[PDB]
């Protein structure tokens, strides 16, 4: 699930109210230094990918050579293909207010022996999926000789990989929160109490999973976790299969 820091702020001070016998009246972030996430992070703890490779026929062109000579021919290939990835985050936390973040990874295709740096975006901050759509360029070429009376077919080919890998979400927690408090006095008045607490006495306070508390460096570190799954072109291969025309050898 998602950890509201807000929620935790409201805990905190509903706890405190009673523990000081005021009567709690309200919470928010602090504007002149609000409770904030930093430093998103998002890593993938078993990068070594086993999932199959597919073998994608990108284009294919014909070269005929209907002469009595050899010619040379020069295959030169451009595409640009798509490959997705999307994100999900299990255990997360939020401010209250979405953030995306971009993330990237140095995965290895065990299949093919070739690693492909894959890229991402996600939130840490709520369990929704997010896609992103990363448009590679491929660009080869292939020279070849074509003998007299042959035809050369070269076919380009993407070698496209996929995964489907669980992701440790990082990142860092800090800020002010504001709480009100009031305590209730004779002849209808009362005098109120403002709190300004740090967030990182919240999550301590509150015991809130998924942190690691620093007074140090006045930060929560908080862990959590996700999934990605996508695809991505790691290589291509031009291949020529030159045959003689009908009625040659």
Do not use: W
């Amino acid at each position: 699930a998602i950890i509201n820091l807000l929620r935790e702020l409201e805990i905190y001070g509903m706890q405190y109210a009673n523990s000081h016998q005021y009567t709690y009246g309200s919470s928010y972030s602090d504007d002149t230094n609000p409770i904030r996430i930093a430093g998103l992070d998002a890593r993938i703890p078993d990068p070594i990918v086993t999932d199959p490779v597919n073998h994608i026929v990108l284009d294919r062109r014909i070269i005929t050579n209907t002469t009595s000579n050899s010619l040379e021919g020069v295959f030169s290939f451009s595409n640009a293909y798509t490959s997705r990835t999307s994100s999900q985050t299990r255990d997360g936390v939020t401010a209250g207010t979405n953030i995306t973040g971009k993330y990237f990874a140095n995965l290895f295709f065990e299949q093919v022996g070739l690693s492909g740096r894959i890229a991402f975006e996600g939130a840490v901050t709520n369990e929704n999926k997010y896609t992103l759509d990363a448009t590679q360029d491929f660009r080869d070429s292939q020279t070849i000789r074509v003998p007299p009376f042959h035809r050369a077919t070269g076919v380009y080919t993407l070698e496209q990989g996929a995964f489907e890998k669980m992701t440790v979400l990082e990142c860092v927690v800090s800020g002010n929160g504001i709480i009100r408090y009031y305590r209730t006095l004779p002849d209808n008045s009362y005098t109120e109490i403002v709190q300004r607490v740090n967030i990182i006495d919240v999550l301590q306070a509150n015991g809130t999973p998924g942190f690691t508390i620093s007074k140090e460096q006045n930060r929560a570190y908080f862990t959590g976790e996700g999934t990605i799954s996508g695809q991505i072109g790691l290589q291509t291969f031009i291949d020529v299969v030159i045959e003689p025309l009908p009625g040659h050898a």
